[PDB]
Structures are given as C-alpha cells and as structure tokens.
Design an enzyme around this catalytic site. Structure first.
Site, PDB file in Angstrom:
ATOM      1  N   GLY A  62      12.209  -8.867  -1.563  1.00 24.44           N
ATOM      2  CA  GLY A  62      11.313  -9.351  -0.410  1.00 24.44           C
ATOM      3  C   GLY A  62      11.307  -7.962   0.470  1.00 24.44           C
ATOM      4  CD  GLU A  63       7.040  -5.057   0.043  1.00 26.68           C
ATOM      5  OE1 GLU A  63       7.469  -3.847  -0.011  1.00 26.68           O
ATOM      6  OE2 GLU A  63       5.901  -5.507  -0.394  1.00 26.68           O
ATOM      7  N   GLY A  64       9.176  -6.614   4.441  1.00 28.69           N
ATOM      8  CA  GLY A  64       8.687  -7.141   5.689  1.00 28.69           C
ATOM      9  C   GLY A  64       9.164  -6.603   6.932  1.00 28.69           C
ATOM     10  CB  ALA A  65       9.374  -6.110   9.961  1.00 23.09           C
ATOM     11  CB  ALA A  67      13.843  -5.369   6.115  1.00 23.69           C
ATOM     12  CD  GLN A  68      10.603  -1.315   0.824  1.00 19.44           C
ATOM     13  OE1 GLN A  68      11.351  -0.519   0.420  1.00 19.44           O
ATOM     14  NE2 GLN A  68       9.393  -1.661   0.344  1.00 19.44           N
ATOM     15  CB  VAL A  69      15.496  -7.836   0.701  1.00 16.87           C
ATOM     16  CG1 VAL A  69      16.905  -8.397  -0.242  1.00 16.87           C
ATOM     17  CG2 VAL A  69      15.614  -7.986   1.962  1.00 16.87           C
ATOM     18  CG  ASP A 179      11.865 -15.693  11.194  1.00 16.77           C
ATOM     19  OD1 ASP A 179      10.936 -16.599  11.457  1.00 16.77           O
ATOM     20  OD2 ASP A 179      11.768 -14.719  10.525  1.00 16.77           O
TER      21      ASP A 179
END
Ligand SMILES: COc1cnccc1Nc1nc(-c2nn(Cc3c(F)cc(OCCO)cc3F)c3ccccc23)ncc1OC
Ligand SMILES: [Mg+2]
Length: 343
Positions: A62-65, A67-69, A179
């Site tokens: 996942g990725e967002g803002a 952060a990448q996971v 969230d």
C-alpha cells in the site's frame, strides 16, 4: 467536565510539541535505531541494507500520503512488513508502543506485532508482522465477482463483533485510532488457522496509526473540532460542525460494517442521522437499524454508547442463527483469499 478544545489533533506543529515534551523519547526506546545516513532505496525485487541485515523487498502492499508499505524477507526466511515514511513518522511508533503497554495481556493477540523502528535522516522504516491475506477492503471487493455479491451476514456479524471488542480495548487505553475503514483492517494466518466455531473471527488486525490520538497527552475533557484529512470520511460531528473525540471511531466502525454489508462506502442523511440504502429486504433489519442508530447518533462526548452492549446485541443474533454456519462461511472466504494471493 469543562471542555478543553484542541482544534486539530493532527496538526504537524502539535505532534512535534507532544513528541518533544515526552520524558521517555521514542529514540530512547530499546527497539529504536538511529542511523546517520539517508533512507536507502527501497523498491520491489531488489535488496537493501537495514542497519546490519540485508532485506529483500517483494512488493508494494500500500501507499498513501508520506508512507509506503512493503512485504519483505530477511537459514529459513521469515516474511515481514516494512512501513517507510518520508519524512520520518515516529508518531505511529509512539502510539503503537503506548497501545501495547496499556492493553490487557489477553487482548494483545488482536493486534499486529511490531519489531523495530529505524530512524534515518530523511525518513523512517518500521518493521511489523505480516498479515498475508490482504485488507478487508480487498476481501469485500472479492465478493463482488461471486453470485453472492457481498459478504454473507454471518461473517459480517462475526467481523463487526470483533471490531467492537477490539476498539473497546483501544479506547480503554485512551487511544483513538482516527481512521477506521476497510482498507486499514488486515487479514492474517489466524483467520486461515481458525478451526473452532467461536463468535469472534481471529486473524483480523487494525493498522495505520497516522491519524491516531493519545488522549493521555491532553487535559481531561479534551474535545476536537477539525474535519478529517484527505483520505478520511467525515464523521457525524464534522458534518454538522460539532466537537468530537471518541465518536470518530464509532463512526469508522459503522462505515466499515456498512461496507461489509453493501460492498460500497457509507453515505449518511438526516431525519436523526441514518445511512442510505438499508432497504426492507435486509436480513436482521431491526438489529442493523438499532446498530446504525446507536453508532451514528451520539448525543455528545459524555454519552458514548457501550461497545460491550453494542456487541452483545449482535451476539444474540449470531448465536441464534450462525453458530452452525460460521465455519463454512470462513472456509469459503479462505478459498477466495488464497485464490487472490495466487493472483
Ligand atoms: C496487507 O497489509 C498489511 C499486512 N500486514 C501487515 C501490515 C499491512 N499493511 C499496513 N500496515 C501499516 C502499518 N501501520 N503501522 C503502524 C503501527 C501499527 F499499525 C500498529 C502498531 O502497534 C500497535 C499494536 O499493533 C505499531 C505501529 F507502528 C505499521 C508498522 C509496521 C508495519 C506496518 C504498519 N499501515 C498500512 C498498511 O496497509 C494499508
Ligand atoms: Mg490514515
């Protein structure tokens, strides 16, 4: 009882002020490591070095803002997860640490394990336990290409009950997740392994502490007023320009359950606040009306509904109808989840 207003609990200045004021800073935690170099290149199908060890990066989860996971591996090789933030987010590690200190030992199994924080000059890498069957959002979407179309009720209720019990514990620690939504729930081996007929589904964890709030860092009676960030759903209070604290998570759990039920995002309306859809044809209609009513119509910060009572009402219906169905319902999802992970 007097309200102490903190306008925006996510404001970057405030987070800085709070983390600076700590007597035990995050850098002093035993499993925090500070490195005097920039964040290495972290991309799929290559290695990189993490302090001493060498880590192979498999793929993006996942990725967002900021952060990448990633999924990653370290003679026998243990799979794990990396959460890479640019710039550094010690805040998540702070909250996750507090949560694990505060939780009763008997509840800790409901949460993803974490292992280390590495603080570099331009970012951070957190290392966590892999839940290898994806997000709850992905699961809901897997039902859309079956004749069923949506998750079956028995599983919806098992999951909803697990969520209520989980957030009860989080709130008992004086933490707000902030969230709660389907793509922040993850599914792991605990679910695969689940052989029994217990009411609560194992292997479900709630992650992403980017909007999390520690109420022990604020005065008694603190309330907030801001609307949510780019990826968040506005809760009832934000929508009607009212103060909130724990209500944000009640709303999130409701939106998540709604999404399990209908396979789409919850939209609400006023008459009393109510979700759209919710047709006469829905199984357990009275239970769901009462569920959504209590989760979405919280008079104020002093009248937070009992998460225990909310769960006990669902449990009565579950015990009546689904005790003898749940194994087969879980197995059917396992079969969809293991097929998805094969691609
Ligand atoms: C299919 O996706 C996953 C599968 N298995 C594990 C994680 C997955 N995905 C996601 N992980 C996180 C995440 N958040 N955090 C922060 C975090 C936490 F969520 C709990 C913590 O401990 C409290 C008890 O769990 C500590 C933390 F630092 C982490 C730390 C370490 C590693 C990951 C995270 N945020 C977004 C994610 O996907 C959108
Ligand atoms: Mg978030």
């Amino acid at each position: 009882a007097p309200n102490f207003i903190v306008g925006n609990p996510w404001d970057d200045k405030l987070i800085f002020k709070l983390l600076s004021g700590l007597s035990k800073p995050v850098s002093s935690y035993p499993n925090t490591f500070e490195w005097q170099c920039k964040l290495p290149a972290i991309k799929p199908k290559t290695e990189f070095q993490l302090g001493s060890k060498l880590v192979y990066v498999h793929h993006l989860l996942g990725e967002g803002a900021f952060a990448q996971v990633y999924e990653a591996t370290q003679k026998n090789k243990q799979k794990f997860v990396l959460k890479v933030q640019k710039p550094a987010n010690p805040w998540e590690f702070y909250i996750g640490t507090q949560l694990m200190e505060r939780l009763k030992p008997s509840m800790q199994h409901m949460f993803m394990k974490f292992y280390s924080a590495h603080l570099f000059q331009n970012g951070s890498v957190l290392v966590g336990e892999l839940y290898s069957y994806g997000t709850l959002l992905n699961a809901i979407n897997l039902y859309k290409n079956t004749p069923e179309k949506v998750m079956p009720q028995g599983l919806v209720i098992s999951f909803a009950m697990r969520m209520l019990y989980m957030i009860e514990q989080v709130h008992d620690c004086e933490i707000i997740h902030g969230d709660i939504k389907p793509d922040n729930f993850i599914l792991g081996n605990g679910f695969l392994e689940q052989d029994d007929e217990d009411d609560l589904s194992a292997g479900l964890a709630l992650i992403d502490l980017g909007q999390s709030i520690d109420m022990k860092l604020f005065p008694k009676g603190t309330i907030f007023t801001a609307k949510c960030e780019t990826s968040g759903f506005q809760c009832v209070e934000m929508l009607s320009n009212k103060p909130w604290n724990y209500q944000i998570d009640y709303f999130g759990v409701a939106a998540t359950v709604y999404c399990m039920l209908f396979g789409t995002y919850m939209k609400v309306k006023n008459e009393e606040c109510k979700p759209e859809g919710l047709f006469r044809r829905l199984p357990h209609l009275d239970m769901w009306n009462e569920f959504f009513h209590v989760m979405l119509n919280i008079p104020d910060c002093h009248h937070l509904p009992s998460l225990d009572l909310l769960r006990q009402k669902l449990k009565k219906v579950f015990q009546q109808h689904y005790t003898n169905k749940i194994r087969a319902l879980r197995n059917r999802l396992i079969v969809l989840l293991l097929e998805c992970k094969r691609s």
